[PDB]
Design a protein around this ligand. Sequence first.
Ligand SMILES: NC(=O)c1ccc[n+]([C@@H]2O[C@H](COP(=O)([O-])OP(=O)(O)OC[C@H]3O[C@@H](n4cnc5c(N)ncnc54)[C@H](O)[C@@H]3O)[C@@H](O)[C@H]2O)c1
Ligand SMILES: NC(=O)c1ccc[n+]([C@@H]2O[C@H](COP(=O)([O-])OP(=O)(O)OC[C@H]3O[C@@H](n4cnc5c(N)ncnc54)[C@H](O)[C@@H]3O)[C@@H](O)[C@H]2O)c1
Lengths: 311, 311
Amino acid sequence: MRVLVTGGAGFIGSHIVEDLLARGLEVAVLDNLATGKRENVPKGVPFFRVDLRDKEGVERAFREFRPTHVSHQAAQASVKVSVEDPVLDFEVNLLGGLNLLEACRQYGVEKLVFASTGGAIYGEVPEGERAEETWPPRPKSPYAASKAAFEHYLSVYGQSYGLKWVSLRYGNVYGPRQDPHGEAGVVAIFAERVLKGLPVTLYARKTPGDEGCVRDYVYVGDVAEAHALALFSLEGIYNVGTGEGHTTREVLMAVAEAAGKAPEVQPAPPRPGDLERSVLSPLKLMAHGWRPKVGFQEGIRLTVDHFRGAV
Amino acid sequence: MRVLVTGGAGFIGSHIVEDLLARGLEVAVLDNLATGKRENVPKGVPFFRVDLRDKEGVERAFREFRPTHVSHQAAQASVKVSVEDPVLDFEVNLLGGLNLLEACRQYGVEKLVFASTGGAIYGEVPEGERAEETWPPRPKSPYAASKAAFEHYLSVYGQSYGLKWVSLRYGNVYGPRQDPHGEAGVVAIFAERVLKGLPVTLYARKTPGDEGCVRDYVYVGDVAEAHALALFSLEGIYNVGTGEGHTTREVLMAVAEAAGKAPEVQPAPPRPGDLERSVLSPLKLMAHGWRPKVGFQEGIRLTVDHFRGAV
Ligand SMILES: NC(=O)c1ccc[n+]([C@@H]2O[C@H](COP(=O)([O-])OP(=O)(O)OC[C@H]3O[C@@H](n4cnc5c(N)ncnc54)[C@H](O)[C@@H]3O)[C@@H](O)[C@H]2O)c1
Ligand SMILES: NC(=O)c1ccc[n+]([C@@H]2O[C@H](COP(=O)([O-])OP(=O)(O)OC[C@H]3O[C@@H](n4cnc5c(N)ncnc54)[C@H](O)[C@@H]3O)[C@@H](O)[C@H]2O)c1
């Protein structure tokens, strides 16, 4: 078993790499360092600094590492950026994604584990409900469209070429090592700024000044666990979430509590591309024994502690 | 109103162009002639020999014609070809489509009418049932994945940038000027071969020697009618089919009757990637008064007549 992790120098990817390493598996990382850092990839790990949009570079990486499994975490991970620059989101997630797929069938890769977005692919999730995998994709932003589109390709690549796959629809992932630049990266932005007495911006879900949007927050540690489970024995679509929603205001207050400092809030109108509410049902995955071993309050404390000592 | 129709030199596109012209509309065509013909575009209609994959080219066409509405019929129309060349299918349908959408946004186009595929997005349609617009996409080939993905982009461009859209899920479109490669290419194949007295290959549905696969055959003239209705007053997803299925054997028998010759049959076992049965529900479009004015038997005669004169 040889696992190639694209975007392995990123937030979630780095946690996947360390997890795989702890399981004694052979791992490699492919990353163009657009948002990730080389420091995130441990010394005893082959690193391929190539862009997925560069066909020649992807082919050389596969040729040198000969992966049996591919964990695809590389992507333009930002709803806002996708709304402002749809072509850039398309090029990396679709175009870059297709290059990866072509390399997989060409090198006979066994399985591909994909990082999809459970938080945005389902569209608005009504009050009191939780999105299930049987729900149809109803993207609102180009980012969600590129992810839904890629799921379709791996589905036809499975049917047409026998490629085994799994699509992990993550909720809002947070935890140590994430950068303060993302829609879900609100936990990192809040933790880093609040600890430093810096004013934070709270985007409304409807009116500047309200509680903000609701999301399903999952600790990155539990996501890495779901990923290992998927890699070894799952096939198909699986939500990776907690099943409980939190408003952005609750996130800030939780972070403020752990940080030990009063927050400075600047209200802002809702930003384009954002859904008002997203909560996922984790039932299908929990049937395989998986469970978020880290609760929200505990997760925030672990993230704040990371930033409090992070340099 | 200025209507630009991509793929206007092809089968369905040419019938759409004539229809819009007969309604006294100002029409333009953009086609790279990959499989289209320059003669299908009538004199007086500005023609832009551009490939959708060429941003500079599409940009130029929009600058000169300044369309208010766009009908997107250009694409890699072969399911079999997408299976053997997914990259080509992706580049033209998604990369090309995306360039088009960006052009629509940049030049403030009002509405985009898309040619989607009913037969391949819904997947296998159970016996006695007819696929409804509310059924989720279950693509099997790269081509179907390409079409389903573009529908997602249309929806997000609608929600994010205000672009009005309509997705027409055509059934098996047949009629004069068609080639033997499209989803209903079997009609052109039988017509040409029966007239020439050449053996006809009849692929089995499940067991060899059966009636063959079931499809919802709609005369191109009727899809042109629906297209005009949608362009002027519809938004959202609409199936464009008769809601009646026909086996390959009856298609051959209808062609034989119209050709007035006993066809030579070359049986063949069922081929993979072929859907057993597809029938669309036309209820949603029918609620707006639309109805096919050309029955199957009549439609096949009109098609066979076209091929008789095809020197
Ligand atoms: N973090 C969340 O809350 C969340 C939730 C659901 C889905 N997602 C999705 O999961 C993945 C992101 O993980 P993260 O939280 O570590 O985010 P991140 O943005 O911190 O990291 C992304 C990583 O991928 C790399 N990358 C980007 N484009 C590349 C390209 N062209 N070629 C090669 N590498 C490239 C970056 O350099 C970086 O290391 C993406 O696929 C994203 O769309 C994120
Ligand atoms: N007719 C059917 O059975 C059927 C059914 C459902 C959907 N479709 C879809 O509907 C549409 C219309 O097809 P048709 O029946 O006229 O078939 P066709 O193959 O005869 O015509 C397609 C036309 O588009 C052009 N084209 C291809 N790539 C291009 C590019 N990159 N840039 C510009 N022009 C390009 C071709 O030159 C041609 O004129 C297609 O988009 C197809 O995917 C076909």
